[PDB]
């Protein structure tokens, strides 16, 4: 079982830049490899087959190389169109195997998130439910941590997070955090805090409200 | 030419089976192998197996031997993949590939869930919290099935500063949330409504974000 080690796993780039991605097979694979790109919600698209042959219709700024266990994909000058996740596939032997891929990301200045917490709506409370939402908007890089606190103590479950893909205009990311509870459990506690930890700072950005205040 | 076209999305029940198809066009079908690949958020890409239409030869990922069955039909140049005894673990996007060309994929959802209309709640800022030149409002679309669902603000008239997040399964059902940011003085003087439509259940729900208190 051939293991493909792809690297880097994450790529912080700028348009026009020259990009090199690497895949090392745990054994000789005799150039039987392909490089493909996949965009969010879209299907894979091959760029290279047999280590260095261009798929018809694929722009020449893409080129491949390597021969034994080491293969590289080079993008001579990155274009907006090139954003997405790149993967390598070895088909020299069954079972076919893939590299873990590398996310290509448009670099920009570090940006902390804009945080906003939202108590349950009155309609939901009427339904017997209680959802406390929190938005951590427009930050960079994509890596961010969120922790919930009720009456001072951390709350682990009832939490469900969702991320957006990098924004085409400002290059930031956003994520929504929802803490769900029953009305009865929600009305037995007062302060609900949302804490976002992000590279842009050591101390987290804290957002909270009190049930008794409203 | 040269292309692979897959069949539509499937909504199957646990314990049941489903058979996916891959129509090949633009090339000699009996000359290339057709492989099937599975993709899930958690497990990434997984080669399921392949079949040679010319020789009926097949090869499977040990992990699928006994779960997936690959067949091919020369007269309609279509490769087939059947999966049996399905579980939520089999919910994924399935692709067929000639290794260079890839199908557009087939989404397979394994669920017992029934069509359910979404509850739509208005998300207003915490009482006060006006501190700032802007104000962020939200919309929570909870408990619906199945997808998709479309929501816009002020009937699409509000598109900038909007973040509609990908839905996720919450106790067998789908939940989604959207935030929109406008300048302070803009809201609440002017009204901001969340339009949510859910075709599957023929539901249309608009709701104004009214200040709390």
């Amino acid at each position: 079982d051939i293991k493909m080690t792809q690297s880097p796993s994450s790529m912080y780039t700028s348009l026009g830049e020259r990009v090199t991605i690497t895949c090392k097979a745990s054994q000789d694979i005799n150039s039987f490899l392909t490089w493909f790109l996949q965009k969010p919600g879209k299907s894979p698209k091959t760029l290279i087959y047999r280590a260095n042959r261009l798929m018809i219709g694929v722009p020449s700024r893409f080129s491949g190389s390597g021969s034994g266990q080491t293969y590289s994909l080079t993008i001579s000058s990155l274009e907006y169109e090139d954003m997405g996740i790149y993967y390598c596939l070895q088909y020299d032997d069954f079972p076919l195997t893939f590299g873990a891929g590398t996310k290509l990301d448009l670099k920009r200045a570090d940006a902390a998130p804009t945080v906003s917490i939202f108590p349950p709506s009155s309609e939901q409370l009427t339904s017997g439910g209680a959802s406390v939402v929190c938005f951590l908007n427009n930050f960079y890089p994509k890596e961010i941590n969120v922790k919930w606190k009720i009456d001072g103590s951390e709350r682990q479950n009832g939490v469900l997070d969702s991320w957006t893909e990098q924004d085409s205009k400002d290059s930031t990311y956003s994520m929504s955090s929802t803490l769900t509870l029953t009305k009865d459990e929600y009305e037995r506690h007062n302060s609900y805090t949302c804490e976002a930890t992000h590279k842009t700072s050591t101390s987290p950005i804290v957002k909270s409200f009190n049930r008794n205040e409203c | 030419q040269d292309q692979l076209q897959q069949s539509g999305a499937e909504l199957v029940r646990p314990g049941a089976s489903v058979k996916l198809s891959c129509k090949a066009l633009g090339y000699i079908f009996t000359d290339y192998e057709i492989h099937w690949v599975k993709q899930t958020p958690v497990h990434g890409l997984e080669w399921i197996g392949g079949i040679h239409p010319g020789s009926s030869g097949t090869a499977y990922n040990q992990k699928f031997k006994g779960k997936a069955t690959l067949t091919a039909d020369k007269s309609s140049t279509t490769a087939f993949m059947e999966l049996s005894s399905l579980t939520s673990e089999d919910s994924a996007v399935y692709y067929c590939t000639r290794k260079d060309y890839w199908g557009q994929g087939t989404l397979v959802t394994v669920s017992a869930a029934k069509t359910t209309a979404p509850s739509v709640y208005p998300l207003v800022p915490v009482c006060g919290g006006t501190t700032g030149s802007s104000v962020t409002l939200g919309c929570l679309v909870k408990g619906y099935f199945p997808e998709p669902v479309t929501l816009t603000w002020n009937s699409g008239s509000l598109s900038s500063g909007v973040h509609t997040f990908p839905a996720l399964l919450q106790s067998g059902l789908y939940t989604l949330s959207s935030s929109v940011t406008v300048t302070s003085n803009t809201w609440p003087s002017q009204t901001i409504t969340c339009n949510v439509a859910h075709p599957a259940s023929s539901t249309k729900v608009d709701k104004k974000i009214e200040p709390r208190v």
Binding site: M55 | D2, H52, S55, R98, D100
Partner: peptide
């Protein structure tokens, strides 16, 4: 464009 130098091993 591409030839069975893609697979051919009849799987």
């Amino acid at each position: 464009d591409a030839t069975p130098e893609w697979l051919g091993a009849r799987l």
